[PDB]
Every structure is written in structure tokens, then in C-alpha cells.
Amino acid sequence: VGACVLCNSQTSLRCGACIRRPFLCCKCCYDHVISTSHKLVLSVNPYVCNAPGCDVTDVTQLYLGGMSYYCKSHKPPISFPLCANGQVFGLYKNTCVGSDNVTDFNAIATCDWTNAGDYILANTCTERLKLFAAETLKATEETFKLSYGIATVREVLSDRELHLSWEVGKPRPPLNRNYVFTGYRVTKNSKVQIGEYTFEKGAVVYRGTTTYKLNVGDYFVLTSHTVMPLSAPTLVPQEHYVRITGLYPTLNISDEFSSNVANYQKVGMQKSTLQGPPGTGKSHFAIGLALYYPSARIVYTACSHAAVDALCEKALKYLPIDKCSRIIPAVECFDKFKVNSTLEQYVFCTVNALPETTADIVVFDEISMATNYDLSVVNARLRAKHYVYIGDPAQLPAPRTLLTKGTLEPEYFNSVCRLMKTIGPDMFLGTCRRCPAEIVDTVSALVYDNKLKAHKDKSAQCFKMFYKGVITHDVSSAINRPQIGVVREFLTRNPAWRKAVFISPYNSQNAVASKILGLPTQTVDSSQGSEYDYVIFTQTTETAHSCNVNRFNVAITRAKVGILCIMSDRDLYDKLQFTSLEIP
């Protein structure tokens, strides 16, 4: 028994063919079943023939006889079709509003999340259907993870390297950082987790969270977790205030956050979004908000543990250590604050582990990776006077494995990322401290509409090179060895660049470069939030993955001083306001 997702009318009918089984009123469920292949509807009891040994389950071919559901063949003389008169039989049939169109729900429910229009409609429907789409997408992802085959340790050559025998009849996952496995120990009659693992092509190179002496017999799977039904909206109803409500300004502020005073007062005058370009002081923004409002209790939330720990770092240099706490569910994270103190003034936790509690301000950092699922639970677990969304829509969101067709724009990353791409951001960091003048001017015109300003001058150590090379593909990545050879030739003539960090949009390209060049290697997706003095970037392809404007933003904005960019795409190479170099 629940509320119709389209109508809010009380109803006890839920679509049993859909993986989420959301509630649907009589008219809504009728239209949803007659328009698609979705025919299994669930009530307090299932709409399934009760005859012994019968399989008729379609909603339109059953009748209520006596106190049960029967097909036409096994029905008693006295029976009535539950599917008739433009409504489906169920509770509260008198109270029913219906909807003019169920096309959006039909599309979201019956899709497979392979088309870009699926995410577009997921982020552009009404709030309740946005929630439905988020839950359905997450459930589809978790189910798709189970379709992958189990890899078992068949041989242990050495440490940090392994041999995996894969299950027959099932596909193998793409081996990269986005697929975190989990080992299991073989016991007498059960299995025990032995930590979370990741694999890479070697023989396979494994980087597990916790080290061991793992031997033959242990196996790995992608751990799935139950997807819980969401009630709270992705965004609370926006209200703007004429004065400061429930908040009490501190009268002494240092020059560290004096630039943020105007933005701090804006937060306290409405129920707010911030777009923060790379190396601008996003944490520098957020921690001073605690200082600007010292009597306020603030919850710190983020999708991943690594980003959560980043917020814990800057609070250490500014905030009281007894007034903070790190919430950890029963990985190694920040372990200097007291653990699991919900009632403390400052709350540090991940989105998926947020406790049911209230606070004056809730700040959600690195809004880019967030999805509507993570947005809703924040509102469901936290009821706050002010909500601050801080991040950057021009940087990478969470990966969308199921998506193959089309490219995802920043407006569709989630409901928050929808806002600043149409109506603009409430606050913005217009001063970039990390990148030199060449890099910032390249990205300012690229995605920030020439609004990002340089703090550093031109470094004269930023170069670009156009080189197609040769593209080679393994099972789940791409390799461009000639581009790596160019880096090696560049390194010999410029030995000072051997302190640089190699970056590429492909894990396999990093692996080849790591052995050939000896530089530290990071993927663009994994490099968000980090800053390096020198970086060498190989695009390695001209695909949409490597040519993504958000990805090209993150890759080249990791440089403190200088960067070298070897381009395969002419478009991004011409957009680089860099010093062009010739191929040797």
C-alpha cells in the first residue's frame, strides 16, 4: 500500500514486471500495462492464476473468482475481469485521478539505459519520475554487475600479480579502476569476504585495498548492494530570504575567507549552488563557512570516501578537533576525528552512510560525481535550514557503464548539475590559483564561458603536439605506443620533465607508459582532485571518451607549473592556447 508515483493517489498496485515495482494508481497502471510488454502487476497478492499447474500471468487475461485469480480456462462460472473499464482492479478504486500521458514513465520503465535520451528524460521529467529513474538506473546497474563472470585465482606467480580463470558462459568485466572487485575465501560450507580488489592487465596486476598471501581457490566478483526506495526529492523547494534566518554571523573574519564573505551571506539568505573550477579553493570555500558561522552545525557529505577525507583535511588546519566527527560504516579513511558521533557539531560522512539527523547547513562537495540517487538520500537523511551544493559541472561525473549511445552533457549529470547549466550558479570561484595562464585561458573559453580568471602568469612551459600515432586495442582499452615514444624522445631532450606524472584517458596506455617511461601514471577520471607540478598527456585516440570536453578539462588542469599535451584530435589541439612543438 502506497502512493501513485504519477498521481499521489493512494494505491496498492505495483508493476511486477519493472525491477523497482513502483506504485501505480488504477488508471496509471492500466495505461502502463496496455501500452508496453509490462503485464505482471503486483497487489497485496500477485495477479497470477491460482489454478494448479497454470502459468497465465498477463494482467488482461485473468478474472476474480471466489477469492482468487484464475485464467479463463480455470475460472468458475461467476468471475469478473480485473482488467476492464479503463482501470485495473485494486484498492481504493473510487479514489483515482489518472494521467493524460504515461509515455515518459513507459519510456523510463521499459528502457535499458543504453541511449542518451534515457538519461535526458531521467533528468528532465518531474521530481517523482526523476526519483523513479534514479532507482531504476541503480538497480539496472547492480543487476548488470551480476551478469559478469567470476574470476578465480588459478595461479600466484608473485606479489601484486595474479592469474585469473574466468567463469564460462558469462562476460568478463572491463578491467580498470571503475570495477572494484572483492575476494572471497573458500571455507568448509560458506564464504567470507577478504577485502575489495581491482585488476589490471599484466597475468593480471591486482591492487587490493588490504594485502594478503592470497592463493589458489579464492575468487573475485563485483559486489552488489540492495537499492533502497527513495522518497525525498533531489532538490528541496527553493526559498529565498530577505534577511539571515537562523544564523548568527561572526564579527571577526580573517583575510583567508574575506573574499568569500559575500558568498557566505548568500548561503544564509536562501535554502544554494556553487560551481568551482579546478584549483580554485573549493575546500577553501567550504571550511570558512564553518568559521563564518561558528555556532552552526554543519554536515559534510560526499559520494566517495576519498572526497570525504579531503574535507576532513582542511577542517584539521582550521576547525576544532573535538567539535568534529568522522562517520564510518561497519576501506581506510580519515581516522583522526572521533568515529560515529552523529550529534557532534561538525559531521563528516559519505552520502551512502548519512545518519538520520538535522543540521543548520549541509554542504555537498564535488557535486559533479553526484547522481539523483545520492541527491535524494541526502534530503531523506538530512533536514537542514540551508543546503550548499559545491562542485563543478564542467568536470567528470560518475561513470555510466550502461550508457553506450550518445554523450552525456553536464546538464543531465543530476538535478543539481541541471541548474547552473541553464539558470547559472548562485556562487562561483572566478580565480584559479593552480593552473598557469596558458591552461586556464584554454579551459576558460572551453567550458566556463571566459569567466575563469588566472592568478598565475604564463609559465612558458606549456606545450602541445599533434601526433596521430598508431592506435591498438586490447579487450577493454586502447594503446598508442607511438605517442608514448614521442614522450620518451621528449624526455631525453628535456630530462627535467621526468618529475612529471603521465596521464591518459586509458588504463592500458598508462600501463605501457609506466614501464617504458617510468613516470607515475594516473587516469583522467582518477586524477580529479589532485594537483601535480608537471604532467604529460596523451589523448591516445579521437573517440568521444578522449575528446570529452569535461575530461579534457580535468586532464590538463592538473598542472601546477607546466604540461605537455600530445593530441590526436585536431579540434582540441587547436583549442589549446599552447606552444606548438614539431614531431622529431
Partner 1 sequence: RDAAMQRKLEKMADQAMTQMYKQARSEDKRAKVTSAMQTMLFTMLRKLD
Q: Is 74 in the site for Zn ion (CB under 5 A)?
A: yes
Q: Using CA atoms, how far apart are residues 245 and 4, in angstroms rounded to an integer?
A: 35
Q: Is 91 in the site for partner 1 (CB under 8 A)?
A: yes
Pairing of strands 62-65, 80-81: antiparallel
Q: Is 543 in the site for partner 1 (CB under 8 A)?
A: no
276 is in an annotated binding site: yes
Q: Which stretch binds partner 1 (CB under 8 A): 64-72, 159-167, 347-355, 442-450?
A: 64-72
Binding footprint of Zn ion, residue count (CB under 5 A): 15
4 is in an annotated binding site: yes
Three-class secondary structure of residue 311 per DSSP = helix
Q: Is 331 in the site for partner 1 (CB under 8 A)?
A: no
Q: Using CA atoms, how far apart are residues 27 and 207, in angstroms rounded to an integer?
A: 53
Grid coordinates given for 139: 538497480
Q: Which is nearer to Zn ion, 36 or 459 (CB)?
A: 36
After which residues does the chain show a gap where C to N exceeds 2.5 Å? 202, 271, 330
Q: Is 109 in the site for Zn ion (CB under 5 A)?
A: yes
CB of 175 to Zn ion, least distance (A): 35
How far CA 343 is from CA of 347, 358, 388, 454, in Å, comes to 8, 9, 20, 41
Q: Is 67 in the site for partner 1 (CB under 8 A)?
A: yes
109 binds, options Zn ion, partner 1, none, Cβ within 5 to 8 A by partner type = Zn ion
473 is in an annotated binding site: no
Q: How many residues does the chain have?
A: 584
484 binds, options partner 1, Zn ion, none, Cβ within 5 to 8 A by partner type = none
φ/ψ of residue 362, rounded to 5:
-115, 120
Question: Hey, what's the torsion of the CAs at 331, 332, 338, 340, to 10 degrees?
Answer: 0
Task: Residue 39: name the closest of 63, 64, 18, 54 by CA.
Answer: 18
Q: Is 445 in the site for partner 1 (CB under 8 A)?
A: no
Q: Supply the DSSP symbol for 421.
A: T
568 binds, options partner 1, Zn ion, none, Cβ within 5 to 8 A by partner type = none
Q: Is 423 in the site for partner 1 (CB under 8 A)?
A: no
Tell which one of 7, 286, 427, 511 touches Zn ion (CB under 5 A). Answer: 7
277 is in an annotated binding site: yes
Q: Which stretch binds Zn ion (CB under 5 A): 16-24, 244-252, 385-393, 469-477?
A: 16-24
Q: Is the CB of residue 369 less than 8 Å from the CB of residue 390? A: no
Looking at this protein, which amino acid is placed at residue 276? G
54 binds, options partner 1, Zn ion, none, Cβ within 5 to 8 A by partner type = Zn ion
Q: Using CA atoms, how far apart are residues 351 and 301, in angstroms rounded to an integer?
A: 6
454 binds, options Zn ion, partner 1, none, Cβ within 5 to 8 A by partner type = none
520 is in an annotated binding site: no
Q: Which stretch binds partner 1 (CB under 8 A): 39-47, 220-228, 234-242, 337-345?
A: 39-47
349 binds, options partner 1, Zn ion, none, Cβ within 5 to 8 A by partner type = none
Q: Is 78 in the site for partner 1 (CB under 8 A)?
A: yes
CB of 234 to Zn ion, least distance (A): 21
Q: Using CA atoms, how far apart are residues 381 and 493, in angstroms rounded to an integer?
A: 56
Task: Residue 420: name the closest of 378, 451, 385 by CA.
Answer: 451
For residue 408, the tally of other CB atoms under 10 A from its CB is 17
Task: Residue 558: name the closest of 527, 526, 523 by CA.
Answer: 527
Q: Is 49 in the site for Zn ion (CB under 5 A)?
A: yes
CB of 93 to partner 1, least distance (A): 8
DSSP sequence for 48-114: ---STT-----GGGEEEETTEEEESSS--SS-EESEETTEE--TT-SS----S--HHHHHHHH--S-
Torsion sign across C-alpha atoms 445, 450, 454, 458: positive
Q: Is the CB of residue 396 less than 8 Å from the CB of residue 528? A: yes
Q: Using CA atoms, how far apart are residues 414 and 396, in angstroms rounded to an integer?
A: 12
Q: Is 316 in the site for partner 1 (CB under 8 A)?
A: no
Q: Is 330 in the site for partner 1 (CB under 8 A)?
A: no
Q: Using CA atoms, how far apart are residues 352 and 494, in angstroms rounded to an integer?
A: 46
Tell which one of 3, 10, 12, 476 touches partner 1 (CB under 8 A). Answer: 12
545 is in an annotated binding site: no
Tell which one of 14, 38, 138, 326 touches Zn ion (CB under 5 A). Answer: 38
Q: Is 229 in the site for partner 1 (CB under 8 A)?
A: no
CB of 66 to Zn ion, least distance (A): 14
Q: Is 95 in the site for partner 1 (CB under 8 A)?
A: no
Half-sphere exposure of residue 95: CA atoms within 13 angstroms, side-chain side: 10
Q: Which residue has the cell 526523476?
A: 130
φ/ψ of residue 408, rounded to 5:
-90, 125
Q: Is 419 in the site for Zn ion (CB under 5 A)?
A: no
38 binds, options Zn ion, partner 1, none, Cβ within 5 to 8 A by partner type = Zn ion
Q: Is 18 in the site for Zn ion (CB under 5 A)?
A: yes
Q: Is 1 in the site for partner 1 (CB under 8 A)?
A: yes
Q: Is 87 in the site for partner 1 (CB under 8 A)?
A: no
Measured CA angle at 526 (ends 435, 287), to 5 deg? 60
25 is in an annotated binding site: yes
Q: Is 80 in the site for partner 1 (CB under 8 A)?
A: yes
- Where does this chain bind Zn ion (CB under 5 A)? 4, 6-7, 15, 18, 25, 28, 38, 49, 51, 54, 56, 71, 74, 109
- Where does this chain bind partner 1 (CB under 8 A)? 1, 12, 43-45, 64, 66-67, 78, 80, 91, 93
Q: Annotated binding site, which residues?
A: 4, 7, 15, 18, 25, 28, 32, 38, 49, 54, 71, 74, 276-283
Q: Annotated binding site for Zn(2+), which residues?
A: 4, 7, 15, 18, 25, 28, 32, 38, 49, 54, 71, 74
